[PDB]
Write a protein that binds this ligand. Structure first.
Ligand SMILES: C[C@H](CCC(=O)NCCC[N+](C)(C)CCCS(=O)(=O)[O-])[C@H]1CC[C@H]2[C@@H]3[C@H](O)C[C@@H]4C[C@H](O)CC[C@]4(C)[C@H]3C[C@H](O)[C@]12C
Ligand SMILES: *C/C=C(C)/C=C/C=C(C)/C=C/C1=C(C)CCCC1(C)C
Length: 226
């Protein structure tokens, strides 16, 4: 009965409720273009719900020795993020009619981000954990650069309503995503300053905002309609 369980429980509830709501709304829509955004966006909190639930029930946690101690590491987070982060990026790419090659590069970079983050999280030599963290953060910054510079450029060719919706979601994404490496650095996976219970809270707030919040903004907009 780990003290972070309460945030895993609340996370499970919020992702579950978000999923159900998006599913109800999405099943009701008949516009083909809107249905695509609903499918992608409903899947995001659906995956997160399954991983939060698994963690709540005591799975996706392993002990990694570093710094002379046995450290608890929630590896299930990375299984969630491996699939949900590219899905969020795909929502943004569809909104701005991004090029196929841009999408492949973004999804590639995002995979490197999550994959190297996981390797870092599991690494037994303390200093090397941070090498992997740095690589992961570089991949993240590539993603954010492309969203901020590249996608905004593409968005300029869309109707103002679509461009406006994209900018809100872009802004939400940059603010929330940029916090993740800092939480990792100061938390259980990194410097061990912020205790696991508080870190779980922080990741829960970030995750729910980045998936359910993002989804609410996108799915209530006229931008998703063809
Ligand atoms: C019964 C099974 C397996 C036992 C072996 C164990 C393993 C992990 C346990 C849960 C978590 O600890 C989180 C949480 C802590 C609260 O305190 C009480 C409720 C809750 C949901 C726990 C219930 C139960 O105890 C679980 C499912
Ligand atoms: C729904 C979940 C979202 C939007 C998660 C985003 C997660 C990141 C942007 C994670 C980035 C990381 C780094 C930049 C380096 C350290 C470890 C990673 C996975 C946390």
């Amino acid at each position: 009965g780990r003290p972070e369980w309460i945030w895993l429980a609340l996370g499970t509830a919020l992702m579950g409720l978000g999923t159900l709501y998006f599913l109800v709304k999405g099943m009701g829509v008949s516009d083909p273009d809107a249905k695509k955004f609903y499918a992608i966006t409903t899947l995001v909190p659906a995956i997160a719900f399954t991983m939060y639930l698994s963690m709540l029930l005591g799975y996706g946690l392993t002990m990694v020795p570093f710094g002379g101690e046995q450290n608890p590491i929630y590896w299930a987070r990375y299984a969630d993020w491996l699939f949900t982060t590219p899905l969020l990026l795909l929502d943004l790419a569809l909104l701005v009619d991004a090029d196929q090659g841009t999408i492949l590069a973004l999804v590639g970079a995002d995979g490197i981000m999550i994959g190297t983050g996981l390797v870092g999280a599991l690494t037994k030599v303390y200093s090397y954990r941070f090498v992997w963290w740095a690589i992961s953060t570089a991949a993240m910054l590539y993603v954010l650069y492309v969203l901020f510079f590249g996608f905004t450029s593409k968005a300029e060719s869309m109707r103002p309503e679509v461009a406006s919706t994209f900018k809100v979601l872009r802004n939400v994404t940059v603010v929330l995503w940029s916090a993740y490496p800092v939480v990792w650095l100061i938390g259980s996976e990194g410097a061990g300053i912020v205790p696991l219970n508080i870190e779980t809270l922080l990741f829960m707030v970030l995750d729910v905002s980045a998936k359910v919040g993002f989804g609410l903004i996108l799915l209530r907009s006229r931008a998703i309609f063809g």
